[PDB]
Amino acid sequence: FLGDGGDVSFSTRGTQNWTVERLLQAHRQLEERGYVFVGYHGTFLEAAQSIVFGGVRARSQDLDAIWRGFYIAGDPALAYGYAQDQEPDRGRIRNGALLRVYVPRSSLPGFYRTSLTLAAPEAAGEVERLIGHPLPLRLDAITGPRLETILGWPLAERTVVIPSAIPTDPRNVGGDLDPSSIPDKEQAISALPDY
Amino acid sequence: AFLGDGGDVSFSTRGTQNWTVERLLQAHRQLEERGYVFVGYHGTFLEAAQSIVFGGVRAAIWRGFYIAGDPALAYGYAQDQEPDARGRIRNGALLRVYVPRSSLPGFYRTSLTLAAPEAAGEVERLIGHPLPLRLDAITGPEEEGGRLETILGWPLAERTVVIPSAIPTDPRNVGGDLDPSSIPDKEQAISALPDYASQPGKPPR
Amino acid sequence: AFLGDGGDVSFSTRGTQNWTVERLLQAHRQLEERGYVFVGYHGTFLEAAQSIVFGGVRAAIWRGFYIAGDPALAYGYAQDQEPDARGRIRNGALLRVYVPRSSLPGFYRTSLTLAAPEAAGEVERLIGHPLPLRLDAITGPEEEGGRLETILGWPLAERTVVIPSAIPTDPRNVGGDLDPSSIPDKEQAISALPDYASQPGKPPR
Amino acid sequence: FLGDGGDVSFSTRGTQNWTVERLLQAHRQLEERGYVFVGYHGTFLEAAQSIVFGGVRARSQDLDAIWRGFYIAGDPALAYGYAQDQEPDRGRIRNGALLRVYVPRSSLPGFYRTSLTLAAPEAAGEVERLIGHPLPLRLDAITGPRLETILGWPLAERTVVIPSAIPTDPRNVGGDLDPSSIPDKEQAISALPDY
Numbered sequence A, D: 001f002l003g004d005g006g007d008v009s010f011s012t013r014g015t016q017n018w019t020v021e022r023l024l025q026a027h028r029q030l031e032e033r034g035y036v037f038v039g040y041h042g043t044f045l046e047a048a049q050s051i052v053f054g055g056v057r058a059r060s061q062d063l064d065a066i067w068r069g070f071y072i073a074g075d076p077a078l079a080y081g082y083a084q085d086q087e088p089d090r091g092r093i094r095n096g097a098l099l100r101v102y103v104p105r106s107s108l109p110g111f112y113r114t115s116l117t118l119a120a121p122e123a124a125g126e127v128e129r130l131i132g133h134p135l136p137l138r139l140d141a142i143t144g145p146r147l148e149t150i151l152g153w154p155l156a157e158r159t160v161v162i163p164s165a166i167p168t169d170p171r172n173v174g175g176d177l178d179p180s181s182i183p184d185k186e187q188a189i190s191a192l193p194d195y
Numbered sequence B, C: 001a002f003l004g005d006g007g008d009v010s011f012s013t014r015g016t017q018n019w020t021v022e023r024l025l026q027a028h029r030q031l032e033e034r035g036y037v038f039v040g041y042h043g044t045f046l047e048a049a050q051s052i053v054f055g056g057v058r059a060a061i062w063r064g065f066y067i068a069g070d071p072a073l074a075y076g077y078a079q080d081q082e083p084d085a086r087g088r089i090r091n092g093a094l095l096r097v098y099v100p101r102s103s104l105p106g107f108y109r110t111s112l113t114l115a116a117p118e119a120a121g122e123v124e125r126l127i128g129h130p131l132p133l134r135l136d137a138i139t140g141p142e143e144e145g146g147r148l149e150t151i152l153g154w155p156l157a158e159r160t161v162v163i164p165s166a167i168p169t170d171p172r173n174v175g176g177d178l179d180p181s182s183i184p185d186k187e188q189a190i191s192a193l194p195d196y197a198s199q200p201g202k203p204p205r
């Protein structure tokens, strides 16, 4: 799904071999096979590597946890909020990676929006009423409050995930994402659907 | 979940446990509402059936996952193809395979058998890129016999939803042919196939 | 009669008059009791439809009558293929073709297209005698596109029973493709096909 | 359906080119395609020619006649009863031809037997009760009293008809069929099914 070029990889230095030109080709291939961009996922270097080359896979633990799903956000500033959780590195923290997440255009009618706050008790009955069955999410996704999206694991596991061209800063490190660092070629590829 | 409601399913020689035509109809309708379309049957031995259903389809020029729109073609593979670990050859199960409706433009069809010399270039012509198949599929005549078989490229096969079939395999006739009268009418009625393209893909609208 | 009860049938652009899924189910069951088995669809223009249904199928190495097990393949021929006498090109009709169950051992199947060089000898090998087909039939891939088409030899074709289908052709989309959702489920459920032999016929038991 | 040899034909002299050896091959081909012998049909020379080469076809007249069908008999002596009806020829009458009639083995469950006399009013309600619908016969046949069989026209028209090897006599002419003239090779091919 990565397009033509050399072996892609993740480093604090940056995703090696990933150009916005390469992004553009890969995005086009995906659109030709009916996949749609639904948001960003920010995570640490080796998690990105696992997702991009191994695939989005759920844990075999906490199978009945009500709010389980794969979290993404339309806003890269939001997703940018995520990188190294492994605080030791010596008290150290690395910059992680931002990834783009795609789902089949036909799964869109299972995507819901609520004004309630996700993963809060009160939002539970509302979401079960939107989704059509008891939680957890299956082949559905829910959007709610800045906005974040959770994909039911059965949906999360069938997505196509490729690297983003918006790079992470080490002199920053999870937070105030520099708007001027988001390539505009990518900005014009990152519109979200309505739910 | 994709198996609807009614307890846990299990594959056994006597037949798939807790699975009924009524429970198939439900799971089917739930999949349709979430945008999935049925594209064929996959026949396999007991243990591959349980794994694929509760674990998922998981992975050469022609590498990919085989399914058949005609239940009868998938039926011949629904049994052990050599004695298992305990020296048994027994009946297996038929699985129903689903893919997103939006993936249908990646499915093509050819009159050539994939063993045919000109097949590789004919396929790369329809698919629009070099083999192996990615998010594409090709349906064509089986090498010997004429029935049509479909190969889903691995990227696509790992994103399918597979549920059990209600068409049973006979333990008193292992290796036997599919008696079409044993296919529940409720299931035949829900197994029409999509028309696949015979011409290369035009740039998307 | 083979059309069951409910008044006289007629083929028109708005659809086959006095024909319903319920009336198809009846005629079908009556044919089964008299030993006939459904083997495919035949798509044609209005006037050939009325003639074949109320007059019968009636008659080169490859001479015979074409039908398709896949309603979608027969649908592309269900319309005028050139302007008629009044300069019109309009939608036609789909017909269901039946043959005696005892004739099934004369139906064979090949992975070869009948345009293929080795096809004539391969067919005469399965059929057991020189072409043209007599009380035999061959099902194989269409020359371009991969779908399977069946040719019934003329002696066999003139002994079929043909009744109308409940799958309608669209007058607002002449030449369009078959929307599989317009095929009544009651009809899909009664259209399984028999398994044809891929090996020559063994001397009868 | 005639087998290998020269062009077959009908004459008072005899069916030209028809040997019991040719009969045997043709019978075998038919049996390999699921057809079964159900009886003989005796008729005049040019009717035989029409049936054998043109096919069993009904008249477009008397469409609602209750007892309409194609008459055959298991017994060739019975069928032998038929030949030239065209009595003028000069008051003359020719010998006709005996033919063998086959139907798909799968049509056999639509074949009924009654002890009542066919084409007699009284037999009507009984036959409609055997056949499952009002007369006339469609894809059915009825056997009844010496025994004769009538095939509904829809069935009659889908039969395969080939010449018999039992020849007609001009010094006889419709009637007392000479038992010694029925080839035994054919006698062993002419058993009827039960109904």
Ligand SMILES: NC(=O)c1csc([C@@H]2O[C@H](COP(=O)(O)CP(=O)(O)OC[C@H]3O[C@@H](n4cnc5c(N)ncnc54)[C@H](O)[C@@H]3O)[C@@H](O)[C@H]2O)n1
Residues within 6 Å of the ligand: B041, B042, B043, B044, B045, B047, B048, B049, B051, B052, B055, B056, B057, B058, B059, B064, B065, B066, B067, B068, B073, B074, B077, B142, B143, B149, B150
């Ligand atoms: N079996 C069918 O439904 C089918 C239809 S057409 C067909 C024929 O099979 C031929 C190829 O056979 P092969 O043995 O080389 C195929 P392959 O070697 O890929 O077979 C893999 C086997 O492992 C099974 N398996 C177990 N677990 C999984 C899992 N989790 N995910 C995916 N697969 C799993 C598969 O069902 C299959 O039985 C084709 O050329 C074709 O003609 N098979």
Ligand SMILES: NC(=O)c1csc([C@@H]2O[C@H](COP(=O)(O)CP(=O)(O)OC[C@H]3O[C@@H](n4cnc5c(N)ncnc54)[C@H](O)[C@@H]3O)[C@@H](O)[C@H]2O)n1
Residues within 6 Å of the ligand: C041, C042, C043, C044, C045, C047, C048, C049, C051, C052, C055, C056, C057, C058, C059, C064, C065, C066, C067, C068, C073, C074, C077, C142, C143, C149, C150
């Ligand atoms: N039409 C289909 O259902 C169908 C399925 S596959 C198919 C394709 O059609 C190609 C051949 O086409 P063609 O035009 O040469 C065939 P052909 O020349 O035999 O066509 C005869 C036409 O006259 C019609 N007709 C009218 N009355 C009768 C009657 N009473 N009995 C029989 N036929 C009657 C037929 O339906 C047909 O429309 C095949 O190679 C095959 O690929 N057609």
Ligand SMILES: Nc1ncnc2c1ncn2[C@@H]1O[C@H](COP(=O)(O)O)[C@@H](O)[C@H]1O
Residues within 6 Å of the ligand: A042, A043, A044, A046, A047, A048, A050, A051, A054, A055, A056, A057, A058, A059, A069, A070
């Ligand atoms: N293969 C993977 N699939 C999904 N999430 C992963 C994977 N590997 C690492 N992760 C990360 O683990 C967290 C999600 O898992 P969970 O704690 O079960 O929600 C996020 O930081 C993911 O980015």
Ligand SMILES: Nc1ncnc2c1ncn2[C@@H]1O[C@H](COP(=O)(O)O)[C@@H](O)[C@H]1O
Residues within 6 Å of the ligand: D042, D043, D044, D046, D047, D048, D050, D051, D054, D055, D056, D057, D058, D059, D069, D070
């Ligand atoms: N093509 C034919 N099909 C059926 N019967 C025929 C045909 N040609 C001549 N006949 C004869 O006509 C009589 C049957 O027709 P009907 O008077 O309608 O019963 C019998 O003598 C038949 O042998």
Ligand SMILES: C[C@H]1O[C@@H](c2nc(C(N)=O)cs2)[C@H](O)[C@@H]1O
Residues within 6 Å of the ligand: A040, A041, A042, A043, A071, A072, A073, A078, A079, A080, A082, A148
């Ligand atoms: C798994 C955790 O990730 C959060 C989120 N992660 C992202 C991301 N990683 O891009 C967006 S929201 C959820 O609130 C959970 O705390």
Ligand SMILES: C[C@H]1O[C@@H](c2nc(C(N)=O)cs2)[C@H](O)[C@@H]1O
Residues within 6 Å of the ligand: D040, D041, D042, D043, D071, D072, D073, D078, D079, D080, D082, D148
């Ligand atoms: C059509 C007529 O033929 C008679 C019969 N004809 C035959 C035959 N031709 O072999 C057997 S019974 C019926 O009684 C009708 O009188």
